[PDB]
Structures are given as structure tokens and as C-alpha cells.
Write a protein that binds this ligand. Sequence first.
Ligand SMILES: *[C@@H]1O[C@H](CO)[C@@H](O[C@@H]2O[C@H](CO)[C@@H](O)[C@H](O)[C@H]2NC(C)=O)[C@H](O)[C@H]1NC(C)=O
Ligand SMILES: *[C@@H]1O[C@H](CO)[C@@H](O[C@@H]2O[C@H](CO)[C@@H](O)[C@H](O)[C@H]2NC(C)=O)[C@H](O)[C@H]1NC(C)=O
Ligand SMILES: *[C@@H]1O[C@H](CO)[C@@H](O[C@@H]2O[C@H](CO)[C@@H](O)[C@H](O)[C@H]2NC(C)=O)[C@H](O)[C@H]1NC(C)=O
Ligand SMILES: *[C@@H]1O[C@H](CO)[C@@H](O[C@@H]2O[C@H](CO)[C@@H](O)[C@H](O)[C@H]2NC(C)=O)[C@H](O)[C@H]1NC(C)=O
Ligand SMILES: *[C@@H]1O[C@H](CO)[C@@H](O[C@@H]2O[C@H](CO)[C@@H](O)[C@H](O)[C@H]2NC(C)=O)[C@H](O)[C@H]1NC(C)=O
Ligand SMILES: *[C@@H]1O[C@H](CO)[C@@H](O)[C@H](O)[C@H]1NC(C)=O
Ligand SMILES: *[C@@H]1O[C@H](CO)[C@@H](O)[C@H](O)[C@H]1NC(C)=O
Ligand SMILES: *[C@@H]1O[C@H](CO)[C@@H](O)[C@H](O)[C@H]1NC(C)=O
Ligand SMILES: [Ca+2]
Ligand SMILES: [Ca+2]
Ligand SMILES: [Fe+3]
Lengths: 641, 641, 436, 87
Amino acid sequence: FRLYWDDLKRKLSEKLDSTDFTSTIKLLNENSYVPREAGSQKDENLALYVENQFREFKLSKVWRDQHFVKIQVKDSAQNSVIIVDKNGRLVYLVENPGGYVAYSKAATVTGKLVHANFGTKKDFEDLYTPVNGSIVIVRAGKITFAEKVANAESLNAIGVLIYMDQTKFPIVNAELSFFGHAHLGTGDPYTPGFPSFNHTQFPPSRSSGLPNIPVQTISRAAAEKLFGNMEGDCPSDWKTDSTCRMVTSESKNVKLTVSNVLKEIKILNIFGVIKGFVEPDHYVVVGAQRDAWGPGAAKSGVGTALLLKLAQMFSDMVLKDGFQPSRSIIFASWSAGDFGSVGATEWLEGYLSSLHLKAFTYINLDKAVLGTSNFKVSASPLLYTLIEKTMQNVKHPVTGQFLYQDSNWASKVEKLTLDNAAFPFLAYSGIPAVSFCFCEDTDYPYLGTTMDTYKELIERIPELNKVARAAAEVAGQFVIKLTHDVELNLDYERYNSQLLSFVRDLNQYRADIKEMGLSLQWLYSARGDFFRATSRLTTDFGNAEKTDRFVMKKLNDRVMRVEYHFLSPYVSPKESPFRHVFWGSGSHTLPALLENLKLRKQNNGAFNETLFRNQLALATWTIQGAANALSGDVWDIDNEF
Amino acid sequence: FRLYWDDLKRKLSEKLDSTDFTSTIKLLNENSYVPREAGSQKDENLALYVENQFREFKLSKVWRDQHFVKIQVKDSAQNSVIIVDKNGRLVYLVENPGGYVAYSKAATVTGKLVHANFGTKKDFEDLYTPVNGSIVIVRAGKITFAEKVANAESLNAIGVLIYMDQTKFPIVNAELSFFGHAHLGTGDPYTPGFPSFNHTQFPPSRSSGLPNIPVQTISRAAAEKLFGNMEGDCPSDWKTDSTCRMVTSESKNVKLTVSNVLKEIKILNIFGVIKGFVEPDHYVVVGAQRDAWGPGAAKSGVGTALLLKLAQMFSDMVLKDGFQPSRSIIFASWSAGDFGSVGATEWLEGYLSSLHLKAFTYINLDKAVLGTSNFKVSASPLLYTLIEKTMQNVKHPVTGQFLYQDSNWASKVEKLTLDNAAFPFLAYSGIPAVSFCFCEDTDYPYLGTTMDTYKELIERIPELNKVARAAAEVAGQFVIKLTHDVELNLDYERYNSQLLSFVRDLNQYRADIKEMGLSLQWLYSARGDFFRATSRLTTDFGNAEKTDRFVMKKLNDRVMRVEYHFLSPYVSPKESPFRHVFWGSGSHTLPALLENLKLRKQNNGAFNETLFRNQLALATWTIQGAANALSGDVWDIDNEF
Amino acid sequence: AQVPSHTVVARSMGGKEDLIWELLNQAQEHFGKDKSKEFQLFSSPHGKDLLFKDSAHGFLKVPPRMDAKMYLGYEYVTAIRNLREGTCPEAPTDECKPVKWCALSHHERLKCDEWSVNSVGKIECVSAETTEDCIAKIMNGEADAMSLDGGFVYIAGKCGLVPVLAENYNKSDNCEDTPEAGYFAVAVVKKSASDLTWDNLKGKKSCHTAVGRTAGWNIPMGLLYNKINHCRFDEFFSEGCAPGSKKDSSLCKLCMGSGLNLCEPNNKEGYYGYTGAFRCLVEKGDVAFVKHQTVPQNTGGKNPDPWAKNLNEKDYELLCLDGTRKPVEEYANCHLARAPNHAVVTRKDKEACVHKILRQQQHLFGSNVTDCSGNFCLFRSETKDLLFRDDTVCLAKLHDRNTYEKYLGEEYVKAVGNLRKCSTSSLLEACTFRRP
Amino acid sequence: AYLAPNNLKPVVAEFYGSKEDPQTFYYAVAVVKKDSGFQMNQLRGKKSCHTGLGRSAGWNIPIGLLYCDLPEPRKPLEKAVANFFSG
Ligand SMILES: *[C@@H]1O[C@H](CO)[C@@H](O[C@@H]2O[C@H](CO)[C@@H](O)[C@H](O)[C@H]2NC(C)=O)[C@H](O)[C@H]1NC(C)=O
Ligand SMILES: *[C@@H]1O[C@H](CO)[C@@H](O[C@@H]2O[C@H](CO)[C@@H](O)[C@H](O)[C@H]2NC(C)=O)[C@H](O)[C@H]1NC(C)=O
Ligand SMILES: *[C@@H]1O[C@H](CO)[C@@H](O[C@@H]2O[C@H](CO)[C@@H](O)[C@H](O)[C@H]2NC(C)=O)[C@H](O)[C@H]1NC(C)=O
Ligand SMILES: *[C@@H]1O[C@H](CO)[C@@H](O[C@@H]2O[C@H](CO)[C@@H](O)[C@H](O)[C@H]2NC(C)=O)[C@H](O)[C@H]1NC(C)=O
Ligand SMILES: *[C@@H]1O[C@H](CO)[C@@H](O[C@@H]2O[C@H](CO)[C@@H](O)[C@H](O)[C@H]2NC(C)=O)[C@H](O)[C@H]1NC(C)=O
Ligand SMILES: *[C@@H]1O[C@H](CO)[C@@H](O)[C@H](O)[C@H]1NC(C)=O
Ligand SMILES: *[C@@H]1O[C@H](CO)[C@@H](O)[C@H](O)[C@H]1NC(C)=O
Ligand SMILES: *[C@@H]1O[C@H](CO)[C@@H](O)[C@H](O)[C@H]1NC(C)=O
Ligand SMILES: [Ca+2]
Ligand SMILES: [Ca+2]
Ligand SMILES: [Fe+3]
């Protein structure tokens, strides 16, 4: 007999009901694997362990890939931070911090220190004192490290100290130290745009996102020792402690020495594929990080455990239970995700032309379990409908209610941040990507620190097997739904809603465009033309035989192409890599257009207006171009008729 | 019953035997159509005539497109050229030439005049006198106008006069004047990279290939009047007349005033499609220019006549004779091909995402009949095998022998030049393109002049109906062969031969690469890996059922993709448009790599060597990337195993 | 013409061969040759040729190696493909299409690509993973020529291939025409252990080159097979290294390569081949089985490799058949047995083009080309012994001797014929099953 | 049956001799009537009976031996053989 959807759902609940994730998360925290830097020996031991497992689960093919990258590691001379007196007669040590920031510049700076709450552009614009020729101190949160260092570099500061404090992060001890990278953008930064193999001879090339100022993390008691000499008062708008202050006293000023060296190491990605029966060409990629600077229980252990048990469930279900997936499935395990996710970016920049339009969905298992209260999802909108159906079938781990409690959940979904690996997939290659967490309201306190381990985890979350059971169930649902049937479950009218929101926002400035001599009407006709495209393709699914397969092939290629066509054809993929107009970086994207048009009404003479004419032309014809390419052939297009 | 190949061949000979092309070429030279500038009223009359014909032949759908471009036309003030004495007391007129060069700069210059035989870089390097601060005069031939003006601009000249002389062009009168454009690259130059519709609001943007010096054509007697004051002697290496000289006398020096204005006109492309029965998605495009500055008998009349009669033969053969083409066919008629082929480039930049990987062959009927002696073909190498079979079946018009007389015809095939419309298709969009002429050994003498008409044509070629009968027969063979069967007749081992030639050339400098610390071996393994790709796909055609269609679909998509993957993914398509590594323009292509590596042994310190490392890395991984993407899936790739 | 028989077919992945073969085994033992009158399987009154043929008399199992292209042969698939596609070949036979040489695993493939570019185009390279798989790739028709030792000239010659050119090992002016005699096979033992004799090898360690070769397999296990008289060998030796055996053995257990590449018969095994077997002896071995030419080529810094840089030849000695230790310089007083030279094999229809092309290629890139570093040398490698043996001078033209049996010769064919019931190579089973 | 998408595999063959000596190959012959008196080479315009299309001793061997003597066009094969015999 055959198997239909409800059989696969109840069978995944039966087979996923038995196994226990707790021993595997305990095993990945053993004394044989507890420090895991990128390219260390322990990483290769866990690597050959995972490849040994994928060989043992009898997957259809298991294969290993390796790269050679350049990372930033510590050296023999300790990097440190010191109050220097105005007299200079004697020297006071704060600490020799165990943490270091990756890709900081090897330098030493002296100067005054200014508190800079989050370093966000809004938080720099409301700042009382000038920032030039000075060192800033910020607290961790709300954005990546690299955007803090990039913003403080833009306002011409000379150094950045980063801490974490009591209000955001309540931790018992004030002594632990943590880790971060400061590369704006992803990838191995000494090979931008092209992969880091032996084939490319390693030419001299340097990415743009690297900072040029020293960056250093400090502990919380180190911060309070600095606040002994600080003065001023934190504003009440800042949810902060009572001990913080604003600027440094007129006599004393800090000094930080940071010494880091560039090591060249060997990255070892490990892959394993289950074939497909209907067509094995197209495939969904499921990924997980593998290494972290501390012990890495909740950062890399949870995702690797969900990866291994998830591979055991699908391989077992295909081999014994007779499930026949129509599309193949690639499982991935990636090294050095901590230095800005270089396993994913080197694998995408390596094999771009091989998975151009073949691969069609990425799923990220990384950081799946942090809290027990809330469910937070973030995805490309072609998956939204999919997520909504999954949220109605997976029962919450604590309470018996379903996950689908809010009907307006599509309004609370926020943008994929730069630290996540879904962002190089979606923003770079044009593949629809998803990432989901059982997150808590406050931040997880010790995430990239030395304390993160299984003991503090199971003390935090008192029952872990039911929670990770639920997250593995959700990530099972996404794979079974995409690969069980001849119809891809991607949904494109969500993109139509996104376009509507954009044009409503731009409509609020119609008077300005009307008086530049420009007309806004062509973008109205562009959006409406996209509506006629997706409505035409919905009726084309309406009039087709679903059991016939060749007429479903020609339509599924169009559904897989409607993600790719939003990539701008007009920017250089080596200069500005993330070229998706809705979720990208640079000046070509749509919120950059809207942002520049806001600086038009600012009237301080800081906008460009020929750049604005080019941005409206290229964005208008990109939306129009995707709308024509979705609906039918060339001759079936109608313009001006 | 069904129809097989030999039935289609004999039926095309029977049906093509009857009709006469001579009246139609005579009709396109009537007093109702004899001047045809771009966007003039006569062009719209011929336009609605051709659309009326395509409606009358009962094609499956006929549709019209329009653009708005910016061209260069004459004004009221006559542009002229004058000998200015050193005294300046009195002025001597040479002529008020009827010709003008398109896209020249509106200016006036005085100075000395230096003969610059062809303006080729080799012909500038062997030049006796310095070229700065001076006007050059060149004779027409061997390259496009724009490369002459670009080279003389690069050596800092201030103006270019262009003529045609007796040795290359033997014409009875020395008085006729001619036309050319001087835009390096194709397309409407005020919209680079994006199309010129009403949707794009017309932003201010200017292409790079536009010159900044005045350019002017002169007649031959005007040239001899200049050579009255010239002195020196032409070298005997130059096949030239007896009246030419080198430089201008110390007293006298020329002055040219060129006034041209930018007009904005309406281009009117006209299209017509025959559907397909097996799959109507993929289609071959057959094109032809329609307007020329003079009467345009051999430049635009012949191609339009072959287009109309060719459409009548295929539409008649499908409707009555029962021929069923597996793929659809688009016929095209393009305005303003004279100003650097802007109909094709605006149609490609307009509908790029619509015909991305759908369209798979372009055929150019333009300038098909010039001479009666030789057959000259130029194509992308996937068509080479195709051309060879056609050259064995089409009988020569004068003598009874076949066209296939040389066995090494693949060595005499030369590169697609920039003036041809096949070059934007192949170099820009990545579609295999072909262009063929019955050419004569010497150049056709009056090609862009005012004399080109049917009288001088039929005086030149004494029998025209048999010759144009033969060229229409060849262009019939290409369409019937590509669309009659389930197997595409593209051939990829020709590309394999091209790679071999490249690596042999680079091997001649192996010592230099060996002493830069670079190893050349990875490119050897790249080429050999491409051989394993195409050999694997040849056996995959070996083991497939040809009558089954779904397993032929998956292989034909790979054959259609092997052209696309040679486009560099690393350059900006707006900055440098022609991005095909074998036949492109810029610094990313392969002969640019080989050229820079020659300047390494030049040792005058004029090469770059970090640019060389980047060029070897990106070219190596582009060849390797296409080789992996041809052979199988991701996991079926083997590197280092 | 002759045709192959009718065949029960079934799908590949879903299977299953064993169940059909059990059922038809009981069918052929009860119902074939008139054991039962009450039912016949090959004849029926309702009609003839139903479910099976009438003139059949029994069922034979197809080996697991043989797929359909190896089943039908090459002439039959070529004829049926020219008949479906509809082409009458003229083939006038003037010029030669480029030879598709075969390689294996990223070192042979590297070298082969470099030779494909240094030649003008007459040589192109297609790679396999093991040498049996490449011989099959010559039979069904993707690969043309290959150089391989005599123990595989036996297998490929039995599968229907002919050797054309032989390798020479002796430098002479007339090497290209003179048929050489054939190299000697020895076993090397330590100086540190002088207790080793031929009469006692049991329970003591060993090192072999590869399973199925001449000096590593046929010459040792023939002369051993007279004395042990057992077909298994992991019981006679405590453990050894012989790559190309099965993964359960100790023979694949003591070998070097990792991970998952242990006992895998390519150059990615560290102990593979001649130099790898010698490194097996030096690192972890009691006896090794190599050619006589191995020790002076790995003695005294002839390799820039470290472990071979420190060694000397007056230690590492060869033992005899009667048990008496002979020093290293005299191999002729006690060789184990002779072995014929390595030879290049190909299909019969390409023999003229492989012959004419390779005689051209040996002149341009052969042994007279000095300044070997930086420029191309066809035969010199970095002691991985790839595509050809590293000490070859020229390659000899063979006239009048182009079969497997006339090339290999009587004593050697008798030796492998004594070994023949113990060979476990599945390709040999397939090429034997094809025979009537 | 070997071709894609069928992907079949031959698993069990059968021999035709006695059990004293199995024979895996068998022969292909062409039986005629006595005193018909015609050669093999000029066999056009006659009545032929085949055991099937694509079968071994019925189709591939006779059309292969008779194959190159037919004039162009040879594709498709059944049209050319259909014009070779008179039915
Ligand atoms: C690929 O390139 C890298 C060079 O970056 C090689 O790896 C390193 O090579 C250098 C030079 O000898 C040494 O530091 C080590 O051998 C390697 N460093 C490591 C592993 O951390 C690598 O050998 C090259 N691969 C090939 C096949 O040439
Ligand atoms: C207005 O925008 C353009 C952005 O393109 C700024 O720079 C121009 O950049 C193009 C290509 O990068 C080049 O032509 C020149 O570098 C700039 N163009 C011109 C006409 O200057 C430009 O600087 C911006 N203007 C202001 C005042 O910010
Ligand atoms: C599309 O753009 C064209 C630009 O060529 C507009 O046509 C011109 O409009 C101006 C302003 O009214 C006038 O010079 C003429 O009406 C047009 N010029 C020429 C040469 O025809 C046109 O209005 C735009 N819109 C539409 C709907 O066509
Ligand atoms: C050598 O080629 C490089 C590559 O283009 C050029 O040098 C630098 O190139 C980068 C990349 O575009 C630019 O950002 C730099 O501004 C270039 N350097 C300078 C000094 O301008 C350059 O064309 C060549 N010459 C040198 C000396 O680098
Ligand atoms: C290797 O080849 C050489 C030829 O280069 C053989 O040399 C001959 O040796 C014998 C005895 O030493 C001499 O009598 C001959 O005159 C030599 N031939 C010449 C000089 O042409 C040598 O025998 C060969 N070795 C083997 C083992 O076959
Ligand atoms: C930078 O800071 C210094 C303080 O040392 C101040 O004098 C100067 O005005 C600042 N720069 C600007 C542009 O305001
Ligand atoms: C060209 O201009 C003047 C006049 O010959 C000369 O002095 C100058 O050096 C030349 N070169 C350049 C680059 O200006
Ligand atoms: C060796 O090389 C020289 C020059 O290349 C050549 O003339 C000679 O014939 C070669 N000898 C042999 C034996 O190949
Ligand atoms: Ca990279
Ligand atoms: Ca344009
Ligand atoms: Fe050997």
C-alpha cells in the first residue's frame, strides 16, 4: 500500500515518541569534546564521529568536504585593559579577560571612555558628548557586534569595549567572559565572493566589512571597576543598573592592548544525502552548527543532537516503514559557524552553479532550544503558509494547547539577522530559508560564554526531553510536507502582501515625488501586475491534472524560480554579495530606497537624488521584471495593450 | 502519416523552388520606403506593412513592441572640414559631407592631421610621429568605427576623420558619403543595462563607451584634396594608393566642425510566433534588421525579404503540409539596428528574465548576400556540427558542388564582431547564435553609403534569385533541424576543443607561472574534468530511450544550461555587460588573462599581477564550476577522492 | 550468429535476486529433466514457450557484477545501437580518434590530465576508482587503453582484451624491439630478525602489494598454496597487509590508510603498491613481497620522503625457498619466481590506433628527455608509481605475441591456474560465467 | 529494458544443452521452403515472418545482416524494411 499525510504524521509521532535526546546532548558535552574551537583536534574527533554515525545510519551517500580559512586566535601576550592616570606615574590593572573579539585589529589605544548604550544609530544620534578621538563602551544586545563596531567606526571612534550587565543578563557571578566576531557580513573574509579551496591559489584579497579599530569584551565586575572612575548619570530611558555612568573623569583615561594573530586552519564540512524516488535532482538542505568557543551546550550541542536523531528518524523511516520521499534530502554539519558562519558561505560560494535552482529550501536547526515560554519563527514568506499549518498540529511541550494561539502571527515575524545561517542562504543564493526557536522573553544569559554547559542548561530548563522533542517534531513536519507529494508547498501571495506594504509606505511621500517631476504611478501598475501574475498561476494550478506529472513539472519550475527573480541583476555579486531586494544589504534594496527618500524631507542636503532616480528605476523594473517572468511566456505579456 | 527528416528536406526544396525573391527586394526599394532612418514615418509604413503580412500569413500570434530611445541626427548647421592656413587670412573649403558619424561629440577642432592607417593598436604602435594634440585620419576597414575612435582617444588625439580609398574599395565615383555609429558596445547608450520603456521613468545615466572627440566621414576626393597639402610617404606594407601621404605640412592644418543633436524617437519592433506541439515553451529566434540610412538594399532589404518569404514558407508548410514542429518559433523584425543594434539589445535587456533558459538559439539573416564566391559562417561552437551537416546538403548557387569543400573549416571560423546582432545575444544573454554570409574576397564597396540600391546590386551580382534561394535554404535547414525532433542538435565537445586550445596557449608560459610561486596544474585538472563531464553526458544519451520524453527532458535541460554556465557570476551585469568568458569584453575574459600574462614577459612594468592572481582564480573556478555542474548531481561530484 | 539466452529480469534497487534464485533452484531440481511426470515446467499442453522457453534445460545464476552491457557483450550492444540509431559505418580508417586512457583516484587523474594537455589532443582521460572497475569500463566501452600488471593481464585477457605494448625495464639501444625476459619477485625480511626461513612463515606478519598482482599475490600465494593447501590465508598468517581483500580480515586490519580507505586498492592507501608495501615492512612488517628492484630505489635518500631517506640496503635482506638467507645484491641465486613485464591492454578494434599513437608519444616524452623537473616527463613520477612503473626505459612493440596466454607464458598461466579456485575477484567470476 | 527509466537488471539465465554440458548461447537461422530456389543476397520483395520487433534471432540479426544494402533514408527502420520486403 501507499502512505498518505496523516500516516506520516502519526508515524513521526510514534517513532519520535520513543527516543531520548538527553543522553546525546550529554554525550556532546563529554571530556573528549568539551573545547571546540574551529579546526582544533576535538572538532575533527566530533567530525569523524558524526561521519561515522551517518555511515552507520545507512544513508544513501555520505561525503566530506574541507576548506582552508583564515581565522583570528589568541597569542602568548595577554590582551588587557588598564586605567591610565593623567600623571602616568603608576598603572592600574582591570583584568586580563579570557574573552577576545574575532577579527579585531591588533593594536593598542589610550584615551577617554564614553558609554554608548547599544551603539545603534538612534542611540548614537541622541548622545550628549562628541565621540571622535575616544573609546566607547557598549552593553551587549539588540544587534550583532559587527554593527556596533561599524557604527562606532563611522563616527570616528578609536576602540570599543563590550560588556553585559545585570538588567538584561542576570547572572550570579560577574566574572565570566565571552566571545564574538566583528565581521560585517558573512564568509571567510580573506576570500570575498569566491570559495577558499586549493584551486583558487589563495590570491591577496580583503573584504570590506573588516573593522580597523581594536575591540575587546570585558566582564561585569571589570565594568564596575571602570564605573568607579566614571561619572554622569544614565538616562531613565535606558533600562540599566544603578552603577552605570556616562563619561570618564577628566584625570583618568583607559588604555586597551589587543593582540590577536591570524591562523590558517582546516574546516571540515560533513554531509549526507537520502535519495528521492520521483525526482532526485531537487533537494531540501537541513543544517546545524558544530563548534563553539566555550563548551557550547545550547549553542552547538542542541542543534547537532537534533541533527543526529533527526537523521536516524528519517533514515529509519525510509528504510523500514516504506516512506518514499519524492525529493532527495541533504543533511549538513558545518564547522566554524561561530566566526560569522563560514561553512555555509564557503559551501554556497563554492557550489553556486551546481545548486542554482536545484535546491529549494534550507532549514536551520541552530539554537532551537533556549526558553520554554514562547515560539519565535523567522522565514522567507514562501514558507509562511507552511509554518501556519505546522503551528496547528504540534502540541506545546509545557501546556496541552497548540502553538497556534495568535491569528496575527505574520505581523510579528521579524527580519533574519546577520548572525544566522539562514541569512546567507536567503540573502545570497536565493533559497527560501527558515529558522525557529523556543525562545524566552529575556535573552538567554550565557550564550557565548565559558559557563554554557549542560548543568546550567538543565537547571534553567527543568525538562529538556519534551521541549527538544517538540522542536524535532516541527522540523520533521517541514521536511515531510515539502517532500511527500508532487506539489511544492511554497506560497507566493505572501510576497504579494509584502509588496502592498512597501507601496503603502512609499505612498506617504507622494507629494515629494510629484514635485520632483517623477510620477509614482508606474510602480502601482507594477504591483498590480504582480497580482495578475500570481492569480494567473493559481488558476493554472486550478486547471491541471495533479496525478499527471509532466504538467506539474512546468509549473513547479516557475514556483521555484519566483524566489530567484527577486535578486537584483544589476549589482556586482563580488562587491555587494547579499543582493535580495527585500532582505539584503547595501543601497540597491527596497528599505534603502525608502530610507534615502526620508532624508529628502530631512532637507539638510544629505540625500543624493540622482541615486534616488536610479534606485526608483531599477527597483521598479525589478518588480516589473519578476511580474512578467512569472506570468506565462514572452508573447503572452501585455504592455500598453 | 508522420514526416521524417528527408521529407522535410525535399519539401523545403520543392516549396522553396517556386517563389521568387527578386520582386520583394525590388518592392522594399520602392519610392514609398526608400529613405529609412530610425523612427521616421517610412519605417512605420514598412512596419505596419510587415505586421500586416504576418497577420496575413496566419501565424499563431503576431505582436508589436515599442521603445523610446535617444539617437544622434543632423541639424540645420552644416558640419564641415576646412584647411586653415597658418596665416589664418583666408579659408579653404574641402566639402560639406552628406555623411555623419552617430554619437560623435558636438564640437569644433583645429590642428594637424596624421594618417593612422587602420587605427588598430598594432597600427598605432608602429607609428612614426606622436599622436597627442592632433587629429588622425584613417581608412575604413578591418574593425568597427568605435574601436578606431576608442583607440585614437586612448592615445589622446582630438579628432578622427574616416574615409574609404581605391585599393580596398574600388568605386567609380569619388564623391559618395557614408554613415557609421561610434558607440563601443551595443544598446541604447543612455540606458545601460536596463531597458528603455516608460516604466523606468528615464533616469539620468550614461554609458561608458561613448567617445568624447568629434568624428567625421569624408569622401575620397575630399581625402585627395587633403593629400594635396599632405607630405611623407605611405609605407609599402600598407596596401594603399599612390596619392596617400603621412602628415600635414608645417604651415597648413585642418579644422572640422561637427554639429549633431540628440533626438528621442520611437522604435517599433515587430514579432510573430508559430506555436509548438510537443513543448511550446522553448523557441528559436530568427531576426532581421529593417532600417538603414541610405536606401539600404543589401543591408536591410535582403534580410527583410528572406524574413518575409521564410515566414511564408514555414507558415504555409505547417498549415497545409502537416509539418508539426516540436518547439515554437519566433520571427523578429527590429528597428534601429544601424545605431549599434538597439532593437536586439533593448529586447534582451527588457525581457531577460522571461527568456532566461527558455530560448535556445538565435539565427541572424542580416547581410546574408554580398558576394557569390565564398561562404563565411560565424557561430557559437554548439552549432558547429549542425553547420557542418547543413554545408553537406545545400548546393552552391553558381557551381553544382556542395558547400563542404574544406575539411578544416572549423579553423577558419572567426570571432563575432561587435557590429553584428548575434554578439549581443551570445555575449550578453548566453544564447547560441549564428550568422552567415555569401561573402566575396574583397569588401562590399558601398555598404553604408548613399549608392546602395537594387540597380548597383543586380549589376554587381548578375543572378540574385539563385543566391538568395540558397541562403534561404540554409536558414531553413537550421530551423527544421532544431525543431523537428526530440533531440536538440547542439554539440558540446566543440567547447572541449576550445578549452584545449586555450590551455595549450597558456602552457607556452609555464616557466613564468612556475617562478611566481603559482602552479598551473589545477587548470589542467579543470580541463580534464570538463572532458569527463561531456563524456559522461554522451553516454547518458547512450543509455536513454529516445521515444520516451521525460527522460529526454532532464538531459535536454543540461544541454541548454551548458551555454549559460560560461557566463561569469562575478562581474556586474550593469558595469560590464558582455560577460561570456570566451567571447566577451573586459578584463574577466580568457584572452584578457592571456594578454596580461604576455605583458608580464614584456618586463616594462606595465602588468598588474594581483589582477593576474585574481584572473587565474576566477577563470579556473569558472571552468571547474561549469564542469561540475554539467556532470550529475552534487554528491556525484568527486574532488580529492 | 550466436545470441545470449533468455533471462529473467528484475529491478535493481528493490531486488531481490536471492529469493527468485531459491525458488527457481527448487524449480530446476524438481521439474527440469523429467523428474516429475505430473507437472512439467519447460513444456505445457496449453501452449509452447509459455513463461520460459521449451528448449531450455536449466537455470544459471548471473553473478552480481554482471549488468546488462556486460551481459550482452560489446559487439552485440554496438550492433544493436547502430541498428536502433540507423547508421551504416563506412570507417575509412585513415586518421585516429583520440585515445581515452583510464586513470584512478586523483593522482593518476592529475598526471593523466597534464599529459592530455602536453599532448596535442590525442590522449584524453577517464577515471575509475579500482582497477577491476576500470577494466569493466574498457569492456563496455568508455575507456580505451590501460597499463596494468600481468596478474590483471590474465583477468582482462580472459574477459576478451588483448595486450599491445609491453614495458621495458632495461636500458639499451634496441629496447624498443627486444622482448625482455621479465622481472623477478622477492620477499624482503629485516636484518633485525634473522630467524625467518621459508620453512617457517606461520603466525608471523606479512606485507603484500595488492590482491591479485604478480609479485604481491600470484608468485607468493602460489608457492605458498603448495605448502599450506588451504584457500584462506588469514589463518596461516597472524596478520598482514594485502589491500584489495575483504574488510573482515586481519589482512585489511593491519594496513595503514584512514579513514574508511583501509585495504582500498588505490593510491589513497598508504601501504598500497610497491613502495607502500616496503613502508609496511619498515614500519610494521615482518616479511614483504615486492619486486627485486624495490630496495635500491628506496635506499639511501633516493626518496626525499623522510622514512626512506634514513634507510640503507645492507640491512634489509631477502630470504630464499630452501631457507638460506642470501644478501641483497644477488637476487638471481634465489628469486621466488619470475614475473612478466607490465603491458598495455585495449580492445581489439582500437589496436592500430593505440599502437600508432603510443609509438608517437613515447618518442616525444620518453626517457631521452632530460631536464625532467619543470618540463614534462611521461614516465617519471614521485615514487607513487603512477600510470606506468617509474623505472621504465621504453615500451616494446609486440609483434606475433598478442593474446593473454602467449604473452604471459606457460609457467605463469599454470601458476595462476593452480591458484584459480581461490581467487575471489568477482570480475573473474563474471568473465568465466560468460563462457559456455 | 536496460534503458532509463526502466533500470532493469538480468538476474537468472538459462542453458539449452544437456546437464552434461550447459550452453548459454544459441544460434539464429533462417528456414525456407524446399525448391524455392533463391539466394540470401537478393531476398527483397519476398514474404518474411519475424518472431517480433526487437527480439534477438528474429529482428536484430536479419536486419543487421541486410542493413547497409538499403538506400537512404534509412531512418526510421520499419519504413525502410517495409519498403524492402513486399509486405
Ligand atoms: C592547499 O593549500 C594550503 C595552503 O594554504 C595547504 O595547507 C597548508 O600548507 C602549508 C604549506 O606547506 C602548511 O602550513 C601546511 O601544509 C598546511 N596547513 C594546515 C593544514 O593548516 C595544503 O597543503 C594545500 N593542498 C594541496 C593539495 O596542495
Ligand atoms: C549622488 O549619487 C551618485 C551615486 O551613483 C554619487 O556618485 C557618482 O558615482 C558614479 C558611479 O559610482 C560616478 O559617475 C561618480 O563617482 C558620481 N557621479 C557624479 C555625477 O559625480 C554622487 O557622488 C552622489 N552625489 C552626492 C552629492 O552625494
Ligand atoms: C513615455 O515616454 C515618452 C518619452 O519618449 C513620452 O513621450 C513624450 O512625451 C513628451 C512630454 O509630453 C512629449 O515630447 C511627447 O508627448 C513625447 N515625445 C515624443 C518624441 O513622442 C510619453 O508621454 C510617455 N508616456 C506614454 C504613456 O507613452
Ligand atoms: C593591480 O590590480 C589591482 C586590482 O584591480 C588594482 O589595485 C587595487 O584594486 C582594488 C580593487 O579594485 C582597489 O580597491 C584599489 O584602490 C586598487 N589600488 C589602488 C592603489 O588604487 C590596480 O588596478 C593594479 N595596481 C596596483 C598598484 O594595485
Ligand atoms: C640489459 O641490456 C644490456 C644492453 O644494453 C645487456 O647488455 C649485454 O650484456 C652482455 C653481458 O653483460 C654483453 O655480452 C652484451 O654485449 C651486452 N649488449 C650490448 C652491449 O649491446 C644486458 O645483458 C641486459 N641485462 C639483462 C638482465 O637482460
Ligand atoms: C574632535 O574632538 C576634538 C577634541 O579633542 C575637538 O576639538 C574637535 O572639535 C572634534 N572634531 C569635530 C569635527 O568637532
Ligand atoms: C602631448 O601634449 C604636449 C604637446 O605635444 C606634450 O608636451 C605632452 O607631453 C604630450 N603628452 C601628454 C600626456 O600631455
Ligand atoms: C632523444 O632525443 C633526441 C632529441 O630530442 C632525438 O633526436 C632522439 O631520437 C631521441 N632518442 C630516442 C631513443 O628517443
Ligand atoms: Ca569566500
Ligand atoms: Ca538599455
Ligand atoms: Fe608488477
